Ligand binder design. Structure first.
Ligand SMILES: CC(C)CC(=O)C(=O)OP(=O)(O)OC[C@H]1O[C@@H](n2cnc3c(N)ncnc32)[C@H](O)[C@@H]1O
Length: 551
């Protein structure tokens, strides 16, 4: 059946709280390195991190924070954010990991979302940088409130160390983290759930203390805080941090950093690999030594086969091995990645990729050879990590067999406590028998997960759900329609290329399109809409990942 178990996981072994993790890390000689520019870096050993955290703890406790209070993080500096996080860990405070607003001058979507979480958490202290504190204080005017409370981190490092750490229990809440989506929800995790993912991820990837980590993704992203940062401290390995805006400005800096620091592992969503591919001209005029890289995780969004293979091809002359890319899938609600694929290879472009007939997406998937049209290719995302169970169910939540697209559900010890102060939302995701409803769509093959879409993308008609490729099919049925792409809109849109570019030929195929779909479906004819000088090397989906990501 479409049910895959990652194997047993000894969660009783190793550290049980994040305070133990920092202690075992403070005993090593490794630590963190913060990149500031091409010729400057700030270092902070794990032993030094522990000390700095105790100093900020003195400050936080001096502002009235008590064990269990939430703290609203608004940081631009990696050094301050990492230290604030571990100060809260020592004091038992609960950080709220959310990104900083693009601008604090005007009322934008980001500022409204910050207000929602700030109000939901009952006006917690906002912890900030010296660089950002000037902007964050402007929220008092945008929010029209007198309860705003802000404080910077740098002045707190000049205090003595408070070595009286609040004794934490595994089930205690460790931090909040905001999702993407309307208003964002507030995911609440515990020491036990985050550590279960760390321990499962270390076992699956064979991470060790000898790794050298490089990450420029935000720490307010679950993959930045758990999959990498906390994994790095749990293994005690060396980790290097860079600012996200520095990569977006000059993507090739990712290659400089990997070479500069001889990094062995890094990650990014698919758009970052595509951004690098756009620099093929300068990549062929540069020089990098990437022979140390062994793990390039690709996750957080759809992993495009053409993207990762062009990536491996461009960087081969610079020493990048052909098996370093590891597609992965995860969510904030399950404390980051729960599957990793180790099948991508430069030579064999079909390894770790599955191609099927488009006509089989609604039934048992029919394998097929890649073709100019009529087929679809998906990147396999791998088996579940130890301790995780994945299954695929239909719209009645019944178990499906493999090679059938369905609703992805997760069961394991990495699952959140739940959305904060939203019993209703928790009921929708927490199904009976301990299954978490991801909202994603995919299938299982040989125990390996592959995502194909999201419930959010389905279209409801007559009180029943349908896929965009189901509607597109009835349109291709119409004579004179070569191919078609649909896009549901709010006051149905159907693009189609005609077999013959001739007016009355195009007008008749357009009529039968608006009519045939209007009769195969119980919808008004008016609702359906048929429609009919430069070349771009970048893929269409990949170019949308870049625009959405940069903005
Ligand atoms: C690798 C992980 C650290 C990613 C993660 O943990 C995160 O992305 O946290 P987030 O809660 O913000 O979003 C979760 C939503 O991202 C989507 N998603 C993630 N990985 C994907 C993939 N490999 N292919 C297609 N979609 C993917 C999915 O819809 C999911 O439900």
């Amino acid at each position: 059946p479409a049910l895959s178990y990652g194997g047993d996981l000894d969660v009783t072994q190793g550290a049980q709280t994040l305070q133990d993790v920092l202690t075992e890390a403070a005993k090593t000689t490794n630590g963190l390195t913060y990149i500031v520019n091409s010729k400057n870096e700030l270092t902070q050993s794990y032993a030094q991190l522990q000390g700095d955290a105790e100093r900020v703890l003195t400050g936080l406790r001096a502002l009235g924070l008590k064990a269990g209070d939430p703290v609203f993080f608004q940081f631009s500096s990696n050094h301050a954010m990492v230290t604030a996080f571990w100060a809260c860990v020592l004091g038992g405070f609960v950080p709220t990991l959310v990104s900083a607003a693009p601008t604090y001058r005007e009322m934008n979507a980001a500022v409204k979302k910050l207000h929602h979480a700030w109000k939901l958490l009952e006006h917690p202290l906002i912890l900030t940088d010296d660089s950002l504190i000037e902007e964050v204080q402007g929220l008092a005017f945008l929010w029209h409130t007198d309860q705003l409370r802000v404080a910077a981190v740098e002045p707190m490092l000049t205090l003595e160390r408070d070595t009286a750490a609040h004794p934490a229990a595994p089930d205690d809440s460790v931090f909040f983290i905001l999702t993407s989506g309307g208003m964002p929800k507030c995911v609440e995790h515990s020491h036990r759930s985050v550590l279960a993912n760390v321990k499962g991820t270390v076992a699956a990837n064979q991470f060790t203390q000898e790794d050298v980590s490089l990450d420029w993704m935000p720490l307010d992203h679950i993959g930045g805080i758990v999959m990498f940062h906390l994994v790095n401290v749990y293994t005690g390995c060396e980790q290097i941090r860079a600012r996200t805006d520095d990569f977006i400005a000059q993507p090739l800096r990712w290659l400089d950093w990997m070479d500069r620091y001889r990094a062995t592992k890094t990650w990014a969503p698919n758009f970052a690999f595509a951004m690098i591919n756009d620099y093929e001209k300068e990549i062929s005029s540069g020089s990098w030594d990437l022979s140390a890289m062994t793990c390039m995780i690709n996750g957080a969004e759809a992993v495009v086969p053409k993207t990762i293979h062009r990536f491996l091809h461009l960087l081969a002359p610079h020493g990048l091995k052909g098996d370093v890319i590891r597609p992965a899938f995860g969510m904030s609600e399950i404390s980051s990645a729960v599957v990793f694929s180790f099948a991508i290879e430069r030579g064999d472009e079909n390894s770790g990729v599955l191609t099927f007939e488009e006509t089989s997406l609604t039934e048992q998937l029919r394998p097929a050879e890649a073709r100019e049209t009529g087929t679809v290719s998906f990147t396999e995302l791998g088996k579940p990590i130890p301790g995780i169970t994945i299954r695929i169910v239909n719209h009645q939540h019944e178990l499906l067999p493999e090679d059938h697209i369905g609703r992805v559900q997760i069961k394991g010890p990495t699952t959140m406590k739940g959305y904060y102060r939203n019993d209703e939302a928790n009921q929708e995701v927490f199904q009976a028998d301990g299954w978490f409803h991801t909202g994603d769509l995919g299938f299982l093959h040989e125990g390996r997960l592959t995502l194909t879409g999201r419930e959010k993308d389905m279209i409801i008609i007559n009180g029943k759900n349908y896929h965009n490729y189901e509607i597109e099919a009835i349109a291709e049925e119409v004579p004179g329609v070569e191919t078609s792409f649909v896009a549901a809109c709010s006051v149905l849109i159907l693009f189609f290329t005609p077999k013959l570019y001739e007016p009355a030929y195009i007008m008749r195929a357009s009529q039968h399109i608006k009519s045939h779909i209007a009769t195969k479906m119980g919808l008004s004819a008016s609702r359906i809409i048929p429609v009919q000088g430069k070349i771009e090397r970048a893929q269409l989906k990949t170019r949308w990942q870049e625009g959405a990501a940069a903005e």
